[PDB]
């Protein structure tokens, strides 16, 4: 074990995009409290804030909506590629492959195009995900356009093939805002390391997706879903959690490496998951989640992080569990691409060295003398 393992606390670069765990608002995007943005904005306002630098006025926002709405369809060649990705593929590999292939079809030929490419990814990723999913799981080639004006509603229209409820559109917008940006985590760092070699925007995103695929980084809301779905009463969940804690099982969705007393994103999504539970008539899943939440506080003094109540919220909107991390990609692409533009404008980055722990120099031995 090396003292500098993981680069914990070592400055790898500079950012104006966000601050996590600082005094005042626990999470800000260009100085705005994420809880304010999630309550009062659509995700396009927040993507615009990250990528273009300021909250848009009504005419900037309308223009941006129109632009994204014209960028939702997939090229024919990309549809043909997604049809050949197996049904049992990891959905994050589908996202990774879609980004990789789109980079060959619509290349970033100059960094002048970088915001057009980021906007294209934000507009097309919901179709990359759902065109593959419904082709392989339902045997249907879907329309990649929809009548929904926002990314969040468009995703639900593609997934379910019907007009989403206004509550469901709202909570999708809330979720995409909540996950949009989180400073220098593993996938944002991967995107910036790639950006530092002056590689193209599709490479940076494809790299970031691969890092988010690892279970120490992505998939915590899927793990929370796999816990809460086990129980048919909140009292069964409590009794079983008490046994898991005695075994020192790690309970995903609880605690945080940076937040000290609460994750600002939790209070937001918890409230919206409660509204969804009431709308859809749920009598078990939200109550199960609350009981686990209460038991984790009483036994371990751990608060729920952003991943815990996202599990139930997505489930109430009909979203298959294996599409949760792909939804995170649709959101966090805004922060990732914004971090790439910062790296390109101010290309300063840490260059780590290694400590050699191998063998001393040794003479070469010929093949037959081995």
Residues 116-135 that bind Cl ion (CB under 5 A): 116, 119-120
Distance between CA atoms of residues 208 and 260, nearest Å = 26
Quick one: which segment of 214-222, 286-294, 297-305, 307-315 binds its own copies (CB under 8 A)? 214-222
321 within 8 A of 232, measured Cβ to Cβ: no
Asked whether residue 134 is marked as a ligand-binding residue, the answer is: no
Asked whether residue 332 is marked as a ligand-binding residue, the answer is: yes
Question: Look-up: residue for tokens 């729920």?
Answer: 304
Quick one: which segment of 121-129, 137-145, 184-192, 300-308 binds its own copies (CB under 8 A)? 184-192
Minimum CB distance to Cl ion, residue 77 (Å): 18
Q: Which two tokens stand for residue 204?
A: 């940076």
Asked whether residue 30 is marked as a ligand-binding residue, the answer is: no
Closest by Cα among 214, 227, 187 to 311: 227
Q: Among 154, 168, 256, 315, which one carries the catalytic annotation?
A: 256
Exposure on the CB side of residue 139, measured as CA atoms within 13 A: 0
256 carries an active-site annotation: yes
Quick one: which segment of 123-131, 148-156, 292-300, 359-367 binds its own copies (CB under 8 A)? 359-367
307 carries an active-site annotation: yes
Minimum CB distance to its own copies, residue 113 (Å): 14
Q: Which of 121, 122, 169, 193 binds its own copies (CB under 8 A)?
A: 193
Distance between CA atoms of residues 333 and 339, nearest Å = 10
Q: Applying CB under 8 A, does 196 fall inside the site for its own copies?
A: yes
175 within 8 A of 158, measured Cβ to Cβ: no
Integer Rg of the chain from CA: 22
Q: Which two tokens stand for residue 157?
A: 């229209």
Asked whether residue 160 is marked as a ligand-binding residue, the answer is: no
Exposed (0-12), middle (13-18) or buried (19+): which is 270, by Cβ within 10 Å? buried
Query: What distances in angstroms separate CA 258 from CA 22, 50, 87, one per listed residue?
Result: 9, 22, 37
Quick one: which segment of 56-64, 114-122, 230-238, 247-255 binds Cl ion (CB under 5 A)? 114-122
Q: Which two tokens stand for residue 119?
A: 């906007």
Minimum CB distance to its own copies, residue 301 (Å): 23
From residue 36 to residue 55, the character string flagging contacts with its own copies as x (rule: CB under 8 A) and all else as - is: xx--xx---x--------xx
In the list its own copies, Cl ion, none, the entry touching 116 (Cβ below 5 to 8 angstroms by class) is Cl ion
Distance between CA atoms of residues 177 and 320, nearest Å = 20
Asked whether residue 247 is marked as a ligand-binding residue, the answer is: no
- Considering the complex, state which of residue 72 and residue 270 has its C-beta at the smaller distance from Cl ion: 72
Distance between CA atoms of residues 106 and 71, nearest Å = 12
Site for Cl ion in 155-214 (CB under 5 A): none
Minimum CB distance to Cl ion, residue 119 (Å): 4
Site for its own copies in 100-129 (CB under 8 A): 100-101, 103-105, 107
Site for Cl ion in 57-86 (CB under 5 A): 71
Q: Which two tokens stand for residue 251?
A: 């309970």
Question: Look-up: residue for tokens 């009483």?
Answer: 298
194 within 8 A of 343, measured Cβ to Cβ: no
Q: Which two tokens stand for residue 270?
A: 């918890």
Q: Applying CB under 8 A, does 10 fall inside the site for its own copies?
A: yes
- Considering the complex, state which of residue 124 and residue 276 has its C-beta at the smaller distance from Cl ion: 124
Minimum CB distance to Cl ion, residue 51 (Å): 11
Q: Catalytic residue positions?
A: 256, 307
Q: Which residues bind Cl ion (CB under 5 A)?
A: 71, 116, 119-120
């Amino acid at each position: 074990v090396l003292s500098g393992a993981g680069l914990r606390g070592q400055v790898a670069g500079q950012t104006a995009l966000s601050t996590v765990g600082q005094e005042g608002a626990g999470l800000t995007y260009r100085g705005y409290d994420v809880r304010d943005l999630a309550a009062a904005a659509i995700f396009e306002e927040v993507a615009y804030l990250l990528l273009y630098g300021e909250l848009p006025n009504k005419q900037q926002l309308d223009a941006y909506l129109k632009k994204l709405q014209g960028q939702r369809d997939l090229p024919q060649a990309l549809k043909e590629v997604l049809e050949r990705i197996p049904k049992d593929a990891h959905p994050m590999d589908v996202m990774r492959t879609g980004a990789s292939v789109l980079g060959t079809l619509e290349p970033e030929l100059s960094f002048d195009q970088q915001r057009d490419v980021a906007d294209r990814l934000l507009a097309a990723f919901p179709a990359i995900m759902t065109y593959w999913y419904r082709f392989t799981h339902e045997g249907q080639r879907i329309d990649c356009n929809s009548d929904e004006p926002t990314i969040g509603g468009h995703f639900l229209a593609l997934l379910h093939g019907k007009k989403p409820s206004e509550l469901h559109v709202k909570v999708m917008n809330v979720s995409l805002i909540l996950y949009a940006e989180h400073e220098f985590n593993a996938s944002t760092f991967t995107a910036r390391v790639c950006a530092s070699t002056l590689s193209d925007l599709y490479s940076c995103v494809t790299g970031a997706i691969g890092s988010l695929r690892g279970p120490l980084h992505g998939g915590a809301n899927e793990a929370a879903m796999e816990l809460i779905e086990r129980f048919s009463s909140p009292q069964e969940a409590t009794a079983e959690l008490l046994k898991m804690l005695e075994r020192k099982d790690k309970i995903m969705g609880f605690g945080h490496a940076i937040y000290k007393d609460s994750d600002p994103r939790n209070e937001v999504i918890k409230g919206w998951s409660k509204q969804l539970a009431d709308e859809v008539g749920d009598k078990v899943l939200f109550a199960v989640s609350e009981a686990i939440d209460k038991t984790m506080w009483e036994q371990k003094k751990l608060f729920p992080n952003a991943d815990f109540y996202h599990a139930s919220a997505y489930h109430f909107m009909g979203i298959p569990t294996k599409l949760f991390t792909p939804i995170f990609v649709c959101s966090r692409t805004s922060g990732w691409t914004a971090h790439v533009f910062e790296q390109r404008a101010n290309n300063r980055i840490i260059r780590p060295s290694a400590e050699y722990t191998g063998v001393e120099q040794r003479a070469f031995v010929p093949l037959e003398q081995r």
